[PDB]
């Protein structure tokens, strides 16, 4: 035996006490190890957060794709963001199953559909909405991370940091920069031009 900063290390002897950690009933995960209910439930929450964000971005896409709005760069940007939030949800679903939890998909609420806001202009308002949405997803990611830290699940904390937190802060800066640019160019010709550059970036 070895005790290292209070942590007991039992030496390697045999694989048999762990054979009891091989479940013998077919409805139970065999992979699950040190993956507690709180972390399972917090992953399920973040799946519903990302999916709802995907749906919200699809609603934004549907508005700017209107012929009388005609901001194709915005529409494509919001469509791709919807695809991305859904990929996040899917990656979290795969992770849940990798750790042996159960994915529990919840309801998705009606999102906002109209983004007609003449004072700021539709484009600036919607990009600010997108920024707020990303910050909301980031808050939930931080909640998820706090659960994982409290449960001493270091594989989960690293998963969240490496797979989601870094992309999240990069998405927020990018959209923040879009808001700043839209404020600088102003409504009308400036917005249209920004939209054309968005369309070119989106290839």
Q: Interface residues for its own copies in 28-87 (CB under 8 A)?
A: 28-31, 33-34, 38-39, 41-42, 45, 48-49, 52-53, 55-56, 58-59, 61-63, 65-70, 72, 79, 86
Query: Directed axis angle between helix 189-201 and helix 166-185, to 10°?
Result: 150
Residue 160 makes contact with its own copies by CB under 8 A: yes
Is 201 annotated as a binding-site member? Answer: yes
Contact, 29 vs 100, CB < 8 A? yes
The structure tokens listed for 33 are: 């190890």
Closest approach, Cβ 2 to its own copies, in A, equals 6
Is 143 annotated as a binding-site member? Answer: no
Residue 203 makes contact with its own copies by CB under 8 A: no
**1 or 5, CB closer to Fe ion?**
5
Closest approach, Cβ 108 to its own copies, in A, equals 4
**DSSP helix/strand/coil, 15:** coil
DSSP string, 127-167: HHHHHHHHHHHHHHHHHHHHHHHHTT-HHHHHHIIIIIIHH
Closest approach, Cβ 193 to its own copies, in A, equals 7
Residue 197 makes contact with Fe ion by CB under 5 A: yes
Contact, 48 vs 100, CB < 8 A? no
Contact, 175 vs 183, CB < 8 A? no
Is 168 annotated as a binding-site member? Answer: yes
Is 134 annotated as a binding-site member? Answer: yes
Is 88 annotated as a binding-site member? Answer: yes
**108 or 170, CB closer to Fe ion?**
170
* DSSP code, position 66: S
């Amino acid at each position: 035996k070895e005790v290292l900063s209070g942590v007991v290390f039992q030496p390697f002897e045999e694989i048999k006490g762990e054979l009891s950690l091989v479940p013998q009933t077919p409805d139970k995960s065999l992979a699950r190890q040190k993956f507690v209910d709180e972390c399972e439930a917090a992953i399920n929450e973040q799946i519903n957060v990302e999916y709802n964000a995907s749906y919200a971005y699809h609603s934004l896409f549907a508005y700017f794709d209107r012929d009388n709005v005609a901001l194709k760069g915005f529409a494509k940007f919001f469509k791709e963001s919807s695809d991305e939030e859904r990929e996040h949800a899917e990656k979290l679903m795969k992770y849940q199953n990798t750790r042996g939890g159960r994915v529990r998909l919840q309801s998705i609420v009606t999102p906002l559909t109209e983004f007609d806001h003449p004072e700021k202009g539709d484009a600036l308002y919607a990009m600010e909405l997108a920024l707020a949405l990303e910050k909301l997803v980031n808050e939930k990611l931080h909640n998820l991370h706090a659960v994982a830290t409290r449960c001493n699940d270091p594989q989960l904390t690293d998963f969240i940091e490496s797979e989601f937190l870094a992309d999240q802060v990069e998405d927020i800066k990018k959209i923040s920069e879009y808001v700043a640019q839209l404020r600088r160019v102003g409504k009308g010709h400036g917005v249209w031009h920004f939209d054309q550059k968005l369309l070119e970036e989106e290839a």
